[PDB]
C-alpha cells in the first residue's frame, strides 16, 4: 500500500565511452556529452605561458596587406573550424531479410561556455581613455560568428572569399588551391560549384574560406549566425533547459553512417586590441554538446554480395581506356526499355520552347 | 518476422535537370536546388584578376554628384536584380473535358551563402586606426538589402527613386525612361502607377529604381527587408532546417505558367571603403534556393479552339481605325442585358453622394 | 471521369471602382487596392524639376529657432498626415423590419513601397568623409514614424506638442489654435481633452501636433511605431504574403459608415543632410493598402421617421433661449421612473466616501 | 423572415462616472477610460507660458553634484510616479450567509499618447552640428522608463538608490527618510526590507527611489521596462487592438478593495539638451488606460459583528503595558492544541541540521 | 441559496520560515519569497558612508595591468557569485517499503529590483560634455551579465579565463589555483575538464573565472545572458505576472537534496566612470526569487542498512595499500557474468575501426 513514485526512464549505466560497450537493447537511449575547444590561430602545443603569453584560445595577431595584391594571412592568424568524431559501437544486422540497425541523433543541447570570462576588464589591452591611457582595458568586441553542426557524416563545405588574390600559405591550412589544384579564380568570390570540400581535418579549414554547404548537407543539421561590425558588443545566452530537435520532415534525424557522429563548431566572439599597436587577436569560446541518440531499423542499401565484385575489381587490371564518363565522354546515348507501350508518333517530344 | 523500417518518400532518380524528363506520375514531388550569384556592378566577363583586382561580386566604385543637377551613376556602380528561370517539362492535358495539369511551387528553402567570408580583416581597405594607418582593415558595413522571390511568372516591378533629375545611362541598364519613353517626372519620386515593369532581363534592373510591385504580383511570393545606415553591422543567419511555405489562403501557391519557374533575388551586404580615397564598392553574396513543387490539376482557361480566331487574326488586315479603346475612346456606353427584371423606376440609381 | 480541380473563390469581375456598380449578392467579397503618397512639406503642384530640384516626396528644409520664443515652422517643412476616402456603393435596406446592410473591412495587406530607393548613395548630400568631401553621400537616416489606419470614419486625432510657444502659420495648416480658437496653453504640452480633431483634410494636419486618439477611435484600427534618434538607420520589411486582421473581440471590424472607407497613413523614413549647410529635408515613402471587405447585416440605428422631426426642425424657429445644456446649465435635476419599487428609506444612497 | 444580425453585448448607457449610478445587474461589464498625465518635475500650477516657457510635461533642469558628498536634487528635477483612483459605487451584500459582491478588473488596454510629438525638430535645443550651431535641434533621447500598474489597492513600493549620501529636500517629496524617520544607510543601496511604502500620494514619490515591490503587490498587476544610455533613441508602439489580461493563475484579477481602482504609471521618454549649457530637462508622455471590469461574488472576510469589538476598543482605555509584540517581546512561547494525538516521544523533533 | 464564490487554493498560514514547521499534508504547496543582494567587490561590513562613500552594491575600482605579465586584480574589484540556501524541514519516510518524500521546486518568479535607480543623473561621475565638464553625469553603461539558478544542490562551476597569467590573490577569493593546487595552464583559457568547482561559498567565486557547468548541473535550472561592449545601454524588464517553469522533460524539477534549496545569481548592470581618472566601478542590482515547491514521493536511493558498513568503515583501519583506482591502477580487468549464453566464437568483438 505504499505510494508509487512517478515513472521515469531508467538509467542502466553511466561513465565514459566504454559504457557504450554494453549490449542494451532496441529501446535504449544514449546521451553523450562532449565539448569542442576553439581552434583559431595559436595551436595548443607550446604549453608554457612564456612563449608569447599563451594565446591558446586566441589568434596570434593580424597584419594588414601592404598593397592591393600582397596578402599573406599567416595561418596562425586565421580562425578555423573545430570538428570531432565520436565513434559509436556496432549494432545488429539482419541480413537474412534486408535491413540493418544504426544510430540516430534525435536531439541536441548545445551551449557556449565561458561568456562571463569577457568581464575581465583589467589587463594590458587598449584602454578606454587613450588620451591619458586610463580607465578600462577595452573588452572583447567586434565581428562574431557562431556555427555548430551535428551530423552522421563530415560537414560539406563550400568555398567563398573576399578578393581571390589572397595568397594563403600552402602548408598547415586547407584552401581552395589545395583542393582544386589550380589557382583561385574570380568565380571563387561569389560561388563556384567546384570549390567544395569536407570537414575531415580539424583546425585546418579557415572559416573565412569554407562555409557550410547548403546544397550538400543531408545527414547534417547545422545552425549558424554572423554579426559583423567593428565594435559590435557580444551577446550570449546560456540555459540548462532548452533543447534543439534534429529531426526532419520525415521524422528521421541524422543517421550515423559508418558508426561515427560528427560534431563541428566555430564560436568567434570578437577581437582584442593590444596597446603598443592596434593588434587584433581573435577570441573564441568552447562549445558544449549533449547529443541524445537512439537505435533505428533502416534498410541495408548495399548488396553485400557485391564484395565478389570487389574481388572481380581486384583481380581485373586497372584500365586506362578511352573517356566514357565526364567531360569528353564518348557515349552518344543510353536508352532504357522497360515495358510495352503502343507505337508512338514522334518518339521524342518534351518541353517545347 | 524482421522489423520494418519507417516509411519515407521514395527517391526515384536524382541528378541534373535531365532527370525531369522521366514521366513519373500524379503524386510525384520534385525538389530543385539552384543558386543565384549577385550581379551588382562589375560583370563577370573579364575573368582575369588583373584588370582591376576582379571586383566580380562587388561594385566598381561610387562617385558622388558634382552639383545638384549632375548625376551620372555609371551602370557598373548600381547593384541590380538577379533573376533566373528554370524551365520545367510539359505535363498532361485532358482537353476532352476542360482541365489541365501544371506545376506548383509548394515550398522553398533559401539561404545566403558566404557570411563568414566577411571575416577577412586583412587586405587593403581603410584601417580602423587611420591616424597611424594601423589596426584592422575595416570589414563590410552599411546599408543592407535582402530580397528574394519565387514565382510562376517574372516579378512585376514598380519605379521609385530619389531625385528624378538623375541621368542614368541609356544603354546596358533599364530605367524609367527606357519603359516610359518620356523623361522622369516628380511623381516618380513617390509613386507613379505608370512606371511599371517586369524582371525579364537579369542584371539590368537596378534595385534603387525597381522595387517589387505590391499591387501586381499574384503568382509570386516575395520576401524582403532593408536596413539603412552608414556603419550598420551586417547580420545573417543560416540554417539547414527551417523552410518557407509558398501557399496562399486558398492553399495553392505559385502555379508555374508556361512551364518556367522564376527565381529573383538581391543580397546587398554593405560597402567596402578603400584606402587612397573613400571609394565605396558594394558587396553581395549569392543566394541558394531549394524549391519543392508538385503537380496540380487546374482548369484550362483559354478556349484553345480560339486558334481559329488567331487564323482569323492573321488573314484579316491590320486596321488603324478610330480610337475605340483607351484615352480618347469613342464608345459612349455599353450595357449588358441578361434576364427579365420587372419594369424599374429611375433605371440608374446607385451610390448617393 | 476527368479530375476535378480544387475549389477557390470565383472572381466575377475586376477592374477599377466602376466594377463596384455590379449588384453581386450577399456573400460577395471585395478586394480594393489603393495607395497613398507621402505629403510631407513640398506640395505636388509645381511639377517642373527646376523650381527647386523637385522636393516632391521630401520636405523643403528645416530652420531652427532663432531664440527661445521665436518658432515659425513654415508649413512646407512639417510632415503631415495622408488620408484618402474610397466611396463604396449603396447596399440593401430592409426597412419593413428594422435592419440594414453595410460594408465591413475584414482585413488589410499594407506595405511601404520604395525601400531600396534609399540605396542611392551618389548625389549631392553631405559626404561620409567631410574633412576631404569624399566617400559616400550619406543616405537617409534619423527619426522614423510609421502609422497607418483603416476605418469606417475619419481618424480622430488628439493634440500634443513640444513647447506650446511655437507659432505655426495660420493658413494652409491645421493646428490647435485653428480648432480651439484661443491660443495654446501649457496643458497642450501633455494632454488636453479639448484639443481633439478629425482627419477630414489631407496634408494639413502635421504629425508633430496631431496623434491618433486612443479614447475616440472605435470604427478605426490604427497601427503605428516611432523610432527617434539622429542617425538611427532605417529598417523596413516588405512581403507579399502576411496580412493584418481588422476584426475586434466581437468579430465585426470597421463598418463603413456613410458608405466611405477611410485610409490614413504617415511614413517618415528619416532625413537628408545637404552640403552647403546641414539642411535636413525629410523623406517619406508611399504606402500600399489592399482592403478585403464583405457585406454585413446590421441594425438600422436611426428611426428614419425622424425626418418629420427634421421637418419640425425646419419650420420651427432657431431659438436663443437660456442655457439649458453645457457649462452654465439651468437644469437642476432629471429623474426617470420606470417601474414600481417598494417604498425606500433614504432615497439616495450610493458610493460612501 | 428578415435576416438576424449577429449578437453583440448590449450597451445600456454611456457617459461619465455618473453612469455608474445605475443598478445594472449581476452580468454587467463596465469599461472605464481614463488617462494619467506625466508628473516629472514642474508642477502644473503656474499656467502662464511666460514663467519659464512652461515646462509642464518636462523637468526643470539638472544640476550635477559639486563634490562627492554634496547632492541636493531640487524636487522639481526628479520625475515622480503618477497615480489616480477611480471610486466605483457600492455593490450588493448578502450577509444572511457570508458572501459579498465586489468589482474585478478583468483586462486593460493601455497606450502612451503623443509619440509623434517628438518629431518637433525645430526649436531652441542643442543643434546637431554644434561647431557651426546649425542643422537639427536634437530630439528627445536618453534613458527611458515605462511602468504602469492596475490594482485594487495602492502600489507597494520599495526603496533603492544610488549613493545613499544624497540629500533630498525634506518637503514636497517622499524619500526613505520621510518613512523611516532615521537617515539612509548603506543597505538602502541594495535592498532594505524596511524601506517600504505605498503610492498614496501623487507626484511625490520619485521614480529613482521608489520601485514597485515584488514581494508585496498581490492585488496589483504592474508591467515595466527600463532602457538606459545617454543617446538611446526612444521607441514606442501604439495600437487600437491589442489588450492585456489582468487575471492570475486562479482566474481572479485585481479585486477592487474598498471600492476604488488604482492606476499608476510613469513614462519617461528621454531628455532634452538646451543650448546655453547642456541642461537636460526630462520628458514624459501621458498614458491612456481603459479598464474592463465585472462583478464577482466573493467571501466576506471580516466578521462584521466585530464592530462590537470596535465598541469594546473605544470604551476600554489606551494601554501602555510591557512589550508583548515585536522586538523586545515578553511572550516566551505559544502552543495550540487541537485534537488527540498518541503520546509522543521527543515532543519537538523537526529539521535536523 | 446564496451564490458560491469561485474555488481558489486555500492559504493555511503565512509568515516567515517558522511557518514551515506546520505538518500540512501531501497536497500542500509552498511559496517562498527571498532576495539576493549583489556581492561585487566592496563587502557590506564597513557600514559607515564615510570610509569611501559606501561602494556597497558597487565595485571598488579597476586598475589595468602595468605590463603584459603583471595582473593583480585586487579581490574587492572582481564581481562574484551570490548564493543562498533555504533550509526546508524534514518530510515523511516510508522505510517499510522503499520510498521517501522530498520537496520539489515546481516554478519560480524572479525579478531584478532597482532598474529605475539608474535614472540618477546628478552626482560626481564623468559628465556628458567633458570639454566643459557640464551636462549630465553619465549613467551606468557597459558589459552586463545576468545569471540566476534554482537548484536542489549547489551550482557546479567550470573555470575559464582570459590570459592564464593573471595573478589573483591567494586569500579571500576562490580561483583555479585554490582548487587545482597547481598553477593555471593554457588549457584553462579554453576548457579544462579538471577546473571544476561548486558554489558553496558566497561572494568568493568571481564571475570572470567560474561559469555554470553545462555537463554537471542536473538538479539545477540556470538561465543566463551576457551583453558585452563599452557603452552598451542597459536594458531591463520587470513584471508581476510572468513565471518560469522548472520542470524537465520527465516533469520532475529540482528535487531538494538534503533538505535545502539553493539560489544563485549575478546581476551586473554596467560600470560607472568617475571624474578624476576614468575609474570604472561595477554596478549590480539585487534579485528577487519566489519559488513554488510541492512534495513528491521518490524512491529512497541508499540502503540505509549500509550504516553498518559505516560501522565497518569506522572500526577497520585506514589503509594505504597499492593503487587500485585512478591513474596508476593495478586492476587489469573486471568481467561480470550474469546468465547462460551459448558458447561464443571470438569472445570479444565490438566496434570495428
PDB file of N, CA and C in Angstrom, chain A residues 289-326:
ATOM      1  N   UNK A 289      28.370  20.167 -26.282  1.00  0.00           N
ATOM      2  CA  UNK A 289      27.338  19.412 -26.977  1.00  0.00           C
ATOM      3  C   UNK A 289      26.817  18.318 -26.060  1.00  0.00           C
ATOM      4  N   UNK A 290      25.516  18.058 -26.119  1.00  0.00           N
ATOM      5  CA  UNK A 290      24.927  16.889 -25.467  1.00  0.00           C
ATOM      6  C   UNK A 290      23.916  16.298 -26.441  1.00  0.00           C
ATOM      7  N   UNK A 291      24.285  15.191 -27.069  1.00  0.00           N
ATOM      8  CA  UNK A 291      23.508  14.597 -28.145  1.00  0.00           C
ATOM      9  C   UNK A 291      22.743  13.406 -27.598  1.00  0.00           C
ATOM     10  N   UNK A 292      21.442  13.386 -27.847  1.00  0.00           N
ATOM     11  CA  UNK A 292      20.575  12.283 -27.471  1.00  0.00           C
ATOM     12  C   UNK A 292      20.270  11.479 -28.722  1.00  0.00           C
ATOM     13  N   UNK A 293      20.712  10.221 -28.740  1.00  0.00           N
ATOM     14  CA  UNK A 293      20.521   9.342 -29.883  1.00  0.00           C
ATOM     15  C   UNK A 293      19.822   8.063 -29.459  1.00  0.00           C
ATOM     16  N   UNK A 294      19.249   7.382 -30.445  1.00  0.00           N
ATOM     17  CA  UNK A 294      18.540   6.128 -30.269  1.00  0.00           C
ATOM     18  C   UNK A 294      18.889   5.201 -31.424  1.00  0.00           C
ATOM     19  N   UNK A 295      18.307   4.008 -31.418  1.00  0.00           N
ATOM     20  CA  UNK A 295      18.606   2.982 -32.406  1.00  0.00           C
ATOM     21  C   UNK A 295      17.412   2.793 -33.325  1.00  0.00           C
ATOM     22  N   UNK A 296      17.650   2.902 -34.627  1.00  0.00           N
ATOM     23  CA  UNK A 296      16.607   2.813 -35.634  1.00  0.00           C
ATOM     24  C   UNK A 296      16.911   1.673 -36.594  1.00  0.00           C
ATOM     25  N   UNK A 297      15.870   0.955 -37.006  1.00  0.00           N
ATOM     26  CA  UNK A 297      15.982  -0.051 -38.053  1.00  0.00           C
ATOM     27  C   UNK A 297      15.851   0.633 -39.407  1.00  0.00           C
ATOM     28  N   UNK A 298      16.840   0.439 -40.272  1.00  0.00           N
ATOM     29  CA  UNK A 298      16.805   1.014 -41.610  1.00  0.00           C
ATOM     30  C   UNK A 298      16.895  -0.112 -42.627  1.00  0.00           C
ATOM     31  N   UNK A 299      16.909   0.237 -43.907  1.00  0.00           N
ATOM     32  CA  UNK A 299      17.085  -0.730 -44.979  1.00  0.00           C
ATOM     33  C   UNK A 299      18.542  -0.720 -45.417  1.00  0.00           C
ATOM     34  N   UNK A 300      19.159  -1.893 -45.445  1.00  0.00           N
ATOM     35  CA  UNK A 300      20.560  -2.001 -45.825  1.00  0.00           C
ATOM     36  C   UNK A 300      20.715  -1.658 -47.299  1.00  0.00           C
ATOM     37  N   UNK A 301      21.400  -0.563 -47.630  1.00  0.00           N
ATOM     38  CA  UNK A 301      21.411  -0.112 -49.027  1.00  0.00           C
ATOM     39  C   UNK A 301      22.215  -1.006 -49.953  1.00  0.00           C
ATOM     40  N   UNK A 302      23.416  -1.412 -49.550  1.00  0.00           N
ATOM     41  CA  UNK A 302      24.397  -2.076 -50.394  1.00  0.00           C
ATOM     42  C   UNK A 302      24.165  -3.579 -50.435  1.00  0.00           C
ATOM     43  N   UNK A 303      24.187  -4.157 -51.632  1.00  0.00           N
ATOM     44  CA  UNK A 303      24.075  -5.614 -51.757  1.00  0.00           C
ATOM     45  C   UNK A 303      25.383  -6.292 -51.393  1.00  0.00           C
ATOM     46  N   UNK A 304      25.581  -6.577 -50.101  1.00  0.00           N
ATOM     47  CA  UNK A 304      26.886  -7.003 -49.600  1.00  0.00           C
ATOM     48  C   UNK A 304      27.501  -8.129 -50.423  1.00  0.00           C
ATOM     49  N   UNK A 305      26.676  -8.912 -51.123  1.00  0.00           N
ATOM     50  CA  UNK A 305      27.208  -9.842 -52.112  1.00  0.00           C
ATOM     51  C   UNK A 305      28.143  -9.152 -53.097  1.00  0.00           C
ATOM     52  N   UNK A 306      27.976  -7.841 -53.306  1.00  0.00           N
ATOM     53  CA  UNK A 306      28.861  -7.072 -54.172  1.00  0.00           C
ATOM     54  C   UNK A 306      30.322  -7.161 -53.764  1.00  0.00           C
ATOM     55  N   UNK A 307      30.635  -7.751 -52.608  1.00  0.00           N
ATOM     56  CA  UNK A 307      32.037  -7.984 -52.283  1.00  0.00           C
ATOM     57  C   UNK A 307      32.707  -8.856 -53.339  1.00  0.00           C
ATOM     58  N   UNK A 308      31.958  -9.767 -53.971  1.00  0.00           N
ATOM     59  CA  UNK A 308      32.534 -10.536 -55.072  1.00  0.00           C
ATOM     60  C   UNK A 308      32.933  -9.603 -56.207  1.00  0.00           C
ATOM     61  N   UNK A 309      32.114  -8.581 -56.474  1.00  0.00           N
ATOM     62  CA  UNK A 309      32.512  -7.542 -57.414  1.00  0.00           C
ATOM     63  C   UNK A 309      33.839  -6.925 -56.996  1.00  0.00           C
ATOM     64  N   UNK A 310      33.987  -6.626 -55.702  1.00  0.00           N
ATOM     65  CA  UNK A 310      35.271  -6.154 -55.204  1.00  0.00           C
ATOM     66  C   UNK A 310      36.370  -7.145 -55.545  1.00  0.00           C
ATOM     67  N   UNK A 311      36.102  -8.438 -55.355  1.00  0.00           N
ATOM     68  CA  UNK A 311      37.040  -9.459 -55.806  1.00  0.00           C
ATOM     69  C   UNK A 311      37.294  -9.327 -57.302  1.00  0.00           C
ATOM     70  N   UNK A 312      36.220  -9.249 -58.093  1.00  0.00           N
ATOM     71  CA  UNK A 312      36.371  -9.036 -59.526  1.00  0.00           C
ATOM     72  C   UNK A 312      37.018  -7.697 -59.833  1.00  0.00           C
ATOM     73  N   UNK A 313      36.947  -6.741 -58.909  1.00  0.00           N
ATOM     74  CA  UNK A 313      37.620  -5.468 -59.113  1.00  0.00           C
ATOM     75  C   UNK A 313      39.081  -5.513 -58.696  1.00  0.00           C
ATOM     76  N   UNK A 314      39.500  -6.554 -57.976  1.00  0.00           N
ATOM     77  CA  UNK A 314      40.882  -6.662 -57.528  1.00  0.00           C
ATOM     78  C   UNK A 314      41.735  -7.446 -58.516  1.00  0.00           C
ATOM     79  N   UNK A 315      41.190  -8.532 -59.066  1.00  0.00           N
ATOM     80  CA  UNK A 315      41.962  -9.362 -59.985  1.00  0.00           C
ATOM     81  C   UNK A 315      41.997  -8.761 -61.386  1.00  0.00           C
ATOM     82  N   UNK A 316      40.918  -8.103 -61.807  1.00  0.00           N
ATOM     83  CA  UNK A 316      40.917  -7.451 -63.106  1.00  0.00           C
ATOM     84  C   UNK A 316      41.881  -6.265 -63.098  1.00  0.00           C
ATOM     85  N   UNK A 317      42.556  -6.010 -64.214  1.00  0.00           N
ATOM     86  CA  UNK A 317      43.564  -4.947 -64.242  1.00  0.00           C
ATOM     87  C   UNK A 317      42.939  -3.568 -64.097  1.00  0.00           C
ATOM     88  N   UNK A 318      43.804  -2.588 -63.864  1.00  0.00           N
ATOM     89  CA  UNK A 318      43.416  -1.185 -63.846  1.00  0.00           C
ATOM     90  C   UNK A 318      43.570  -0.635 -65.258  1.00  0.00           C
ATOM     91  N   UNK A 319      42.448  -0.279 -65.880  1.00  0.00           N
ATOM     92  CA  UNK A 319      42.416   0.047 -67.297  1.00  0.00           C
ATOM     93  C   UNK A 319      42.466   1.557 -67.474  1.00  0.00           C
ATOM     94  N   UNK A 320      43.107   1.977 -68.563  1.00  0.00           N
ATOM     95  CA  UNK A 320      43.122   3.381 -68.950  1.00  0.00           C
ATOM     96  C   UNK A 320      41.947   3.667 -69.874  1.00  0.00           C
ATOM     97  N   UNK A 321      41.891   2.973 -71.001  1.00  0.00           N
ATOM     98  CA  UNK A 321      40.734   3.071 -71.878  1.00  0.00           C
ATOM     99  C   UNK A 321      40.598   4.446 -72.481  1.00  0.00           C
ATOM    100  N   UNK A 322      39.451   4.699 -73.102  1.00  0.00           N
ATOM    101  CA  UNK A 322      39.118   5.975 -73.704  1.00  0.00           C
ATOM    102  C   UNK A 322      37.959   6.601 -72.944  1.00  0.00           C
ATOM    103  N   UNK A 323      37.929   7.926 -72.821  1.00  0.00           N
ATOM    104  CA  UNK A 323      36.982   8.563 -71.896  1.00  0.00           C
ATOM    105  C   UNK A 323      35.540   8.226 -72.235  1.00  0.00           C
ATOM    106  N   UNK A 324      34.889   7.509 -71.324  1.00  0.00           N
ATOM    107  CA  UNK A 324      33.479   7.180 -71.446  1.00  0.00           C
ATOM    108  C   UNK A 324      32.624   7.830 -70.374  1.00  0.00           C
ATOM    109  N   UNK A 325      33.220   8.606 -69.477  1.00  0.00           N
ATOM    110  CA  UNK A 325      32.478   9.329 -68.461  1.00  0.00           C
ATOM    111  C   UNK A 325      33.153  10.668 -68.233  1.00  0.00           C
ATOM    112  N   UNK A 326      32.346  11.714 -68.104  1.00  0.00           N
ATOM    113  CA  UNK A 326      32.886  13.009 -67.756  1.00  0.00           C
ATOM    114  C   UNK A 326      32.731  14.081 -68.810  1.00  0.00           C
TER     115      UNK A 326
END
